[PDB]
Ligand binder design. Sequence first.
Ligand code: HEM
Ligand code: HEM
Ligand SMILES: CC(C)N[C@@H](CSC[C@H](Cc1ccccc1)NC(=O)OC(C)(C)C)C(=O)NCc1cccnc1
Ligand SMILES: CC(C)N[C@@H](CSC[C@H](Cc1ccccc1)NC(=O)OC(C)(C)C)C(=O)NCc1cccnc1
Lengths: 462, 462
Amino acid sequence: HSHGLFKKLGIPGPTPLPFLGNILSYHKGFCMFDMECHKKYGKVWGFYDGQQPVLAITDPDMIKTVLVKECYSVFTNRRPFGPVGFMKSAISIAEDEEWKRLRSLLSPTFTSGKLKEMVPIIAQYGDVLVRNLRREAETGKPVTLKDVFGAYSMDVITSTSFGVNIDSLNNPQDPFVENTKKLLRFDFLDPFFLSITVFPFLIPILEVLNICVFPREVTNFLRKSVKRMKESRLEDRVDFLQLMIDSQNSSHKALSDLELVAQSIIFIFAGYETTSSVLSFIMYELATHPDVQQKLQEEIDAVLPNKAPPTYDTVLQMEYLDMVVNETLRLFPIAMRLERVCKKDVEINGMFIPKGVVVMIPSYALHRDPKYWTEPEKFLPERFSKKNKDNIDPYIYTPFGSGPRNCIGMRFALMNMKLALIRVLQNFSFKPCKETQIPLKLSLGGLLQPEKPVVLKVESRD
Amino acid sequence: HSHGLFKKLGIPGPTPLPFLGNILSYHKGFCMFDMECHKKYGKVWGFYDGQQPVLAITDPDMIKTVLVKECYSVFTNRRPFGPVGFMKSAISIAEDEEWKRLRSLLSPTFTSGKLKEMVPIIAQYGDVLVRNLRREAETGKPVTLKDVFGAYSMDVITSTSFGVNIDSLNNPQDPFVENTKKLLRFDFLDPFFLSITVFPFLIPILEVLNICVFPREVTNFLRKSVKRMKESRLEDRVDFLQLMIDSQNSSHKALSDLELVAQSIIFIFAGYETTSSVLSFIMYELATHPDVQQKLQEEIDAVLPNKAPPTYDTVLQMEYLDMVVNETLRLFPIAMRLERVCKKDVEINGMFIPKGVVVMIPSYALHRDPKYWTEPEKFLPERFSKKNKDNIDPYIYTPFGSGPRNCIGMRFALMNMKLALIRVLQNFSFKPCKETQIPLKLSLGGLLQPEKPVVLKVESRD
Ligand code: HEM
Ligand code: HEM
Ligand SMILES: CC(C)N[C@@H](CSC[C@H](Cc1ccccc1)NC(=O)OC(C)(C)C)C(=O)NCc1cccnc1
Ligand SMILES: CC(C)N[C@@H](CSC[C@H](Cc1ccccc1)NC(=O)OC(C)(C)C)C(=O)NCc1cccnc1
């Protein structure tokens, strides 16, 4: 059973039911379960996802050893979560030596250099986003942000990774738009993924029936799509695909054709719903904190007078904008948790850790700990002012994780989201509607997302 | 193992491999496997779908006992085929007493009476089909029949079962059109369904993970869609839904709300790809047999002079049209086989049949038997002339099965397909293109469908 393990080592936690372990306590979501545990049990605790032991840790020293010092030797991989098919070769899923080789063949894709190159592409779709917004702003109808930010996020994905150029909002039925919309963030508390936790032995079975968590058709579409573009650019700069094609010419072992496809898909999956979700959470805070929206709009006009177009350099110039983005990510860190599988009997910061345990960092709960954040629930961007940004522990605030396996798309994600904000706020202000949910409720599911979706009023600064 | 059963009873057949049984012999498809067996082995034979024994029978007496005389007592159900979820309640899947109750609450829906009522609806989409065809006939581009007949078939389904009215071809992106297109005939020789045959014990497992062969979203869409229409017509004639709603007012036990949904879905699944597939096979024969198309066009003009609109009565008037439809269904009976599970030790026409065996009628192969059809591969509509239609055994030619469990949608299916043909042939002629596959090859898969899809030239009789 292994349900005696934490009781032995002296670690506290909720008592597990047979077979289910502690999963019935997810009825209120990971976020509410994690805070409770931190409160009830202290700096460390333990629980069981079925029979799999999970050790939670909240001490910044312990957290650093795990994600940095002993990342290569001990805590290199994440927990498997379901049948993956050929997506086993995607960087975020791959393990150990395959992972290290993959992370290397793809890191130059995410340098500040290649990213400054991509700025003018992502900018062009700032414009598209505006026109589409004004069309809803010239017709005084409340607006669903995720719909319009999704269309933008999508637009940016297609171009920055394949060269394809569509305003998805107006071609909602373009093939390259349909498949991609199906690529939604996995709800790890829906019937299926729960069942996987009760029956992880079911995972092999499903794999032998080529059942996949990435719908077989979406993937089949993109593979040939990629294997077509591969053989249309070759032969006839500047997207993720080309960067990867260019890499399997001129670790090591180059990148396989199918390995290349899986990375294409993962970048899509990672960047789509996330970008659009964070952008929604930020407009929710700007509409319910009018000062902050006004202070930010003023800042944007000074750097970019005359609605001047944002550039890479003038984006990194804006401090309040960076403050606002970070404080949103504090209150809504959409990964919720960080996790590593401990692959060896180990002892770190004076605590034994037996093989196979899952080490977990409860990010959401640390972001709202009163022991590090005064008034943690209030939206106060000044926590991140260059005055106070020094009193913030990088192992307490980790919206992109930390260490060698942190978010590879971090710089890009922030740059994408900020370009969107600048062009939007150059043009509109955003006001609560009667139908706006104040104060926002987080979904009880396994996603950090709003219970009810965000709807606001949008007015032209003209 | 049970792999000794046929060897014992004195029945011949191919030797089964361990675990796989005879399935490796499906590499050429059910149709080619069935003919071979009939040839090699005679009037009866046996084989194993994994460990499940299947007895084939080709004697018309034996076939009648099975589908008619002993249908209620012995051969009431079909073989399960995969995880079905809530679609377990659909008539074609349900079993025994539930089946008999369902077949009864739905039979009045398929009377000649209700069907004559539906004629003017299905006719209106004959017109739509024309306009769309002429648009491709005024632009001399070869035409893919299944695309244009699919759009028609779809159009007819939506209206005859929910009142919805769209020209799907031009609204290819209407929600009510997207879901329905996913409802495609199951390929019982793709990786998944084969695996089910090797691991039928996997079926329970999949059911406990709410995995379904009817994609959970399509079904989720229609349920609420139906539960909306149910509560918009009620309260504010003339489709399958209303007929079923009217039935759960004024066997017995009425029809449950969820039972009603499953029938809605099955009619869609049954009528969509089938109608469009048969209609394609018929235009393939009319284009490669120009006499027959001309003789039929002449017949239509005499009954309906001046492109007069077809009616129920003038449709049943047309004999050559009926001949042509039937002879197509002979060469392409798209179910391929009929099957019943023997639920008891039984002895019929002097042959023992142990419990649990699957009794199978190899329709495709009987339709092409030289022992009943001279020149079986030739397309000769005169086999069905009212002169020779008496020399045809109803248990050899069974495109809709036979007995209490035969195709409930038969009259409707024929009437739909004939209305389509009349309106089309009143207006166009259909000629081979260079890119037409002559002679058509049947797919080696588990569907009766063309290897390559049918493309023809379409000319206005104007
Ligand atoms: C607001 C946007 C995003 C947020 C908040 C976010 C957050 C995270 C977090 C917390 C992790 C886990 C880090 C760890 O385990 O320590 C992660 C991993 C990852 N992210 Fe993101 N992410 C975002 C957008 C993106 C984008 C746009 C990409 C585009 C390529 C991307 C690619 C990845 C990859 C590939 C990994 C796994 C890396 C590895 O295992 O080596 N992410 N992300
Ligand atoms: C060209 C069109 C069609 C052909 C060739 C066809 C053929 C067949 C065949 C061979 C069977 C099995 C009969 C048996 O087991 O003896 C069947 C069953 C069935 N068909 Fe069709 N079919 C067609 C269209 C339709 C349509 C339009 C509907 C619309 C409602 C429909 C509804 C059903 C149902 C419900 C069953 C199962 C009945 C029961 O189990 O009681 N079919 N069909
Ligand atoms: C393979 C994929 C399905 N599983 C992850 C592996 S990476 C860790 C993720 C990151 C994440 C970030 C934001 C929102 C959701 C998830 N989940 C993580 O919280 O783990 C537990 C749920 C605690 C087990 C993946 O690759 N996701 C692609 C991606 C998405 C978003 C940002 N960056 C990358
Ligand atoms: C539940 C559904 C997935 N399975 C069938 C049960 S009915 C027997 C069918 C009929 C059929 C006709 C034409 C084309 C394909 C199938 N298959 C049959 O050949 O069985 C074996 C494959 C030999 C095992 C169902 O309900 N199909 C709805 C339907 C479709 C078409 C016509 N009428 C009804």
